[PDB]
Design a protein around this ligand. Structure first.
Ligand SMILES: N=C(N)c1ccc(O)c(Oc2cc(C(=O)O)cc(Oc3cccc(-c4ncc[nH]4)c3)n2)c1
Ligand SMILES: [Ca+2]
Ligand SMILES: [Ca+2]
Length: 223
């Protein structure tokens, strides 16, 4: 996250860190046994870290649980990043408390202009590299589809939305992938891709969650 602020320990209780010996992607807890992340974050041997603030310090409210099953969306296309969403089932149920909570699925899509909260442990520099140890937050509006498509001709599908600022300076970035985009209390997006970070006229691109609720609900119920 570029140009955001320190969230504060456990202010985003549904935020998950995917670890394979190090942090490599964010995720969202949707219930005691399931996590939603981006398909491009798929790896074998994932450990889900819940209740995290500083990812390099054991602060006391963490739960570390291995993944038993990973399910990449059936139509995920690694070339276009169309349908960039995956579900991760935990080995054992997480213990929900004030620091570890689930986020609800939307009952409808959100309008352009709606303010969202994006969070992650990704790079905080526009051009350069600096990774934070603590969770970073950013408030950003969903952009009109026409501005999204104008920034990335021929690359935006109906399963994607842009959020951010056209003027640059504030965005998600490498390390934030798979992380939540919450608008009006519902998970509306997943950090997917971009062109650089916080660059002018290059907003962040996010998986549009509202198109996947029946797939999510049906998949979890059968696994
Ligand atoms: N500014 C952001 N909001 C943002 C969010 C997450 C990131 O990881 C990110 O940074 C990057 C970094 C690269 C890279 O170094 O190769 C690729 C990428 O997008 C890709 C990667 C792979 C494919 C594509 C692609 N294919 C066709 C459309 N887009 C884009 N995103 C930026
Ligand atoms: Ca801390
Ligand atoms: Ca920690």
């Amino acid at each position: 996250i570029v140009g955001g602020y320190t969230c504060g320990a456990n202010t985003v209780p549904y935020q998950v860190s995917l670890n394979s010996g190090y942090h490599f992607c964010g995720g969202s807890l949707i219930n005691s046994q399931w996590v939603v992340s981006a398909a491009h974050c798929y790896k074998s041997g994932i450990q889900v870290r819940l209740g995290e603030d500083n990812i390099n310090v054991v602060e006391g409210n963490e739960q570390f649980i291995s993944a038993s099953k990973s399910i990449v969306h059936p139509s995920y296309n690694s070339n276009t990043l169309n349908n960039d969403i995956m579900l991760i089932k935990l080995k054992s149920a997480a213990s929900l408390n004030s620091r570890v909570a689930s986020i609800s699925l939307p009952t409808s899509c959100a309008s352009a202009g709606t303010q969202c909260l994006i969070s992650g442990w990704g790079n905080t520099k526009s051009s350069g590299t600096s990774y934070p140890d603590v969770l970073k937050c950013l408030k950003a509006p969903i952009l009109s589809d026409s501005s999204c498509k104008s920034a990335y001709p021929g690359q935006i599908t109906s399963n994607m939305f842009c959020a951010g600022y056209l003027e640059g300076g504030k965005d998600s970035c490498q390390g934030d992938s798979g992380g939540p985009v919450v608008c009006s209390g519902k998970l509306q997006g997943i950090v997917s891709w971009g062109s650089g970070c916080a660059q002018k006229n290059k907003p962040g691109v996010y998986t549009k969650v509202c198109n996947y609720v029946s797939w999510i609900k049906q998949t979890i119920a059968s696994n």
